[PDB]
Design a protein around this ligand. Structure first.
Ligand SMILES: Cc1cc2nc3c(=O)[nH]c(=O)nc-3n(C[C@H](O)[C@H](O)[C@H](O)COP(=O)(O)OP(=O)(O)OC[C@H]3O[C@@H](n4cnc5c(N)ncnc54)[C@H](O)[C@@H]3O)c2cc1C
Ligand SMILES: [Cl-]
Ligand SMILES: [Cl-]
Ligand SMILES: [Mg+2]
Ligand SMILES: [Mg+2]
Ligand SMILES: [Mg+2]
Length: 302
């Protein structure tokens, strides 16, 4: 990978960080080294990076805030592209917002709601990036990205860039086409909001932020909800009903207030988290005969 790293440095793509700990780049603050973590300074830099990747035929993964990732302790091979400050453009034109994939979702929800534009209040507590929200079809409070997205600009591995419409994104619960048929990087999105009375929109937005304070981790690092809900049961309630809140393995524990979040109490390894996940699964399978599946994404090594 030495030469991949070199070409990237020569292209001035932005930061080119060798053996970079993914613990620095995930909300749960866990994870080993990426061989090469690139932090592109702009959209062209992302294209330049992907072309190097294509040439040397190495592995790539795009990340935003790492808010749904449990990266394993031996990190990630190949190139990791973090979309962040280099891709944080944001412009409002009437009821349409055009926003780079690196922009903070919480920031967008906060500022857009303050403009009286309704449709992003639901996202005020989703601590990811726009590109990751598009990839995940992120959702809360009965809404999601699919309700407001007009189109998304995708960079494919082969270097082609294409605007996919809402329908072409094939959104469903926690799902988009980037996860399956058409993998690629979301560089930019156009979102459609609705102009309404500002104060009520701001209120809803803040209400949703308060909801996070009352029911979910604040003091400890954590990733997104761990398990899919085995409907009509909720994973969190099953875990709580089995008395596993606060249950600890190593530095990892089930949060004290929410059964579906594992927090990094301090010093947690990926192994701790994985063990905890398996232990919760065993416990719920024994008690309820339910096999729970992960929603949090496990990445690294393989
Ligand atoms: C406390 C907490 C609360 C959360 N609450 C919610 C919630 O209510 N609803 C919800 O849906 N999620 C929630 N999440 C999960 C997470 O915030 C979202 O899934 C978010 O959309 C992920 O963004 P990232 O930008 O954080 O993605 P990661 O950086 O976390 O990326 C996740 C996946 O998207 C891919 N990816 C990232 N960026 C791109 C890109 N630009 N192009 C293509 N692929 C990309 C990655 O490869 C990976 O597969 C929560 C997380 C935490 C920690
Ligand atoms: Cl950044
Ligand atoms: Cl906790
Ligand atoms: Mg240039
Ligand atoms: Mg027993
Ligand atoms: Mg029994």
């Amino acid at each position: 990978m030495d030469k991949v790293i070199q070409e990237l440095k020569d292209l001035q793509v932005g930061k080119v960080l060798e053996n970079e700990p993914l613990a620095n780049h995930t909300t749960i603050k866990i994870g080993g080294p990426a061989d090469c973590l690139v932090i592109p300074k702009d959209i062209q830099a992302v294209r330049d990076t992907m072309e190097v990747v294509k040439n040397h035929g190495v592995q790539w993964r795009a990340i935003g805030r790492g808010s749904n990732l449990l990266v394993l302790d031996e990190g990630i091979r190949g190139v990791v592209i973090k979309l962040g400050a280099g891709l944080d453009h944001m412009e409002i034109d009437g009821e349409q917002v055009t926003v780079g994939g690196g922009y903070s979702v919480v920031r967008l929800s906060t500022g857009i709601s303050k403009k009286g534009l309704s449709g992003l209040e639901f996202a005020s507590g989703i601590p990811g990036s726009v590109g990751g929200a598009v990839y995940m079809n992120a959702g809360a409070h009965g809404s999601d990205i699919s309700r407001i997205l007009v189109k998304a600009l995708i960079l494919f591995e082969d270097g082609t860039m294409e605007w996919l419409t809402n329908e072409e994104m094939e959104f469903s619960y926690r799902t988009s086409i980037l996860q399956n048929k058409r993998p690629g990087i979301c560089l930019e999105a156009v979102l459609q909001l609705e102009q309404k009375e500002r104060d009520a929109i701001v209120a809803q937005m803040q209400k949703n932020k308060d909801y996070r304070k009352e029911t979910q981790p604040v003091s400890n690092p954590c990733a997104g909800s761990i398990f899919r809900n085995p409907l009509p049961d909720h994973a969190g309630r099953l875990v709580e009903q089995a008395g596993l809140k606060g249950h600890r393995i190593g530095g990892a524990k089930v949060s004290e207030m929410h059964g579906n979040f594992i927090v990094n109490a301090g010093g947690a390894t990926a192994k701790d988290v994985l063990d905890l996940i398996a232990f919760i699964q065993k416990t719920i399978k024994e008690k309820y005969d339910i096999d729970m599946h992960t929603e949090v994404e496990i990445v690294g090594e393989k």
